[PDB]
Amino acid sequence: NPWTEYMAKYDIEEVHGSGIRVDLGEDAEVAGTQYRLPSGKCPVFGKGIIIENSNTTFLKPVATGNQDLKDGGFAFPPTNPLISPMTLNGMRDFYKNNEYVKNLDELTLCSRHAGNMNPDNDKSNYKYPAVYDYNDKKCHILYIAAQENNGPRYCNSMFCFRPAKDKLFENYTYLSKNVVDNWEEVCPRKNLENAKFGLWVDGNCEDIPHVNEFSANDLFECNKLVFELSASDQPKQYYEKIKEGFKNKNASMIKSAFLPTGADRYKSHGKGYNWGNYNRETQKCEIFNVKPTCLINNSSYIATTALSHPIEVE
Amino acid sequence: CWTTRMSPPMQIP
Numbered sequence: 001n002p003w004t005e006y007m008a009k010y011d012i013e014e015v016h017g018s019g020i021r022v023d024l025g026e027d028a029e030v031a032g033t034q035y036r037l038p039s040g041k042c043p044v045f046g047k048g049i050i051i052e053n054s055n056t057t058f059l060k061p062v063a064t065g066n067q068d069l070k071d072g073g074f075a076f077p078p079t080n081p082l083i084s085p086m087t088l089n090g091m092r093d094f095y096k097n098n099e100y101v102k103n104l105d106e107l108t109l110c111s112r113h114a115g116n117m118n119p120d121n122d123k124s125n126y127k128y129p130a131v132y133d134y135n136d137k138k139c140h141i142l143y144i145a146a147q148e149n150n151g152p153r154y155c156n157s158m159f160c161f162r163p164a165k166d167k168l169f170e171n172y173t174y175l176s177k178n179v180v181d182n183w184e185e186v187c188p189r190k191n192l193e194n195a196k197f198g199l200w201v202d203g204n205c206e207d208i209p210h211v212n213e214f215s216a217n218d219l220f221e222c223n224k225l226v227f228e229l230s231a232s233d234q235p236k237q238y239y240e241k242i243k244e245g246f247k248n249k250n251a252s253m254i255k256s257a258f259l260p261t262g263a264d265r266y267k268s269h270g271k272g273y274n275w276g277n278y279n280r281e282t283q284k285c286e287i288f289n290v291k292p293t294c295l296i297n298n299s300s301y302i303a304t305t306a307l308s309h310p311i312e313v314e
Numbered sequence: 315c316w317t318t319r320m321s322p323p324m325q326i327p
């Protein structure tokens with residue numbers, strides 16, 4: 001296969017290795033209790049969190065003081081010295097003596113800066129995820145690592161939210177603690193214009209044999225759909241029902257926000273509907289869940305993935 | 315509430 005090196009970055013199980021829609025691929029202890037947290041190795045271009053039934057956007061600081069959780073955002077609260085949000089130039093200055101950090105690209109640097117803040121002032125491997133906003137070149141550490149809480153049961157005083165690609169998020173990038181320093185080389189970013197993903201068989205690039213066709217008005221809408229259907233580390237819809245009726249809603253909110261591990265069955269390890277061939281002429285997003293291993297030249301197509309930016313082409 | 319992991323270690327409350 002002459003395509004092996006080129007296509008390696010589309011083997012999302014291998015190169016990313018965790019959920020994309022919801023990335024909760026590892027667990028880590030904080031003060032001796034385990035919590036779920038993001039672990040994907042690739043940046044997720046254009047992902048943010050929509051907070052339902054609230055005007056607050058998710059990069060606002062988590063609620064502190066007398067603020068209710070449902071009225072705040074996900075980000076680090078203000079500190080002294082102020083370490084989140086921090087501009088790219090601010091991070092480079094902060095780490096100017098550390099040759100191992102100060103020249104990282106913006107996304108890895110933001111991931112490493114978030115991973116610098118140990119919540120165990122006394123010991124821990126828990127490392128917050130982060131969002132880098134390309135519009136104002138700011139790294140936001142996310143204090144809340146949850147990404148979806150939107151089931152029918154409570155979604156109220158309830159903090160309800162879901163991950164999405166959205167025009168409002170197109171310059172955001174969702175970063176776990178594990179984002180690799182060479183993601184430009186090994187992870188998707190650009191959509192591939194005039195190209196269709198295929199499978200290499202016996203010296204020829206064949207079509208993906210089974211795809212799931214979702215209509216989509218443009219590439220952005222196709223990327224949004226692939227993201228919605230992609231690898232995910234928690235169920236989209238969570239006698240066990242009788243026992244759920246004894247749970248308290250406010251306690252449940254807290255569990256859904258901080259994610260105490262007290263479920264590897266849920267981990268995708270990157271398996272899912274991570275790819276789509278967008279036919280711009282028929283307005284079909286042809287979505288599939290097996291890794292592609294070659295490209296077909298076809299001027300009607302753009303090849304996208306759940307990790308890819310929703311607009312940029314090459 | 316946080317302590318930096320990379321030197322120089324620092325309290326950031």
Ligand SMILES: *SCC1=CC(C)(C)N(O)C1(C)C
Pocket residue numbers: 030118119120315316327
């Ligand atoms: S200091 C209170 C506190 C410590 C830490 C573990 C980091 N938590 O997250 C809070 C903010 C509650």
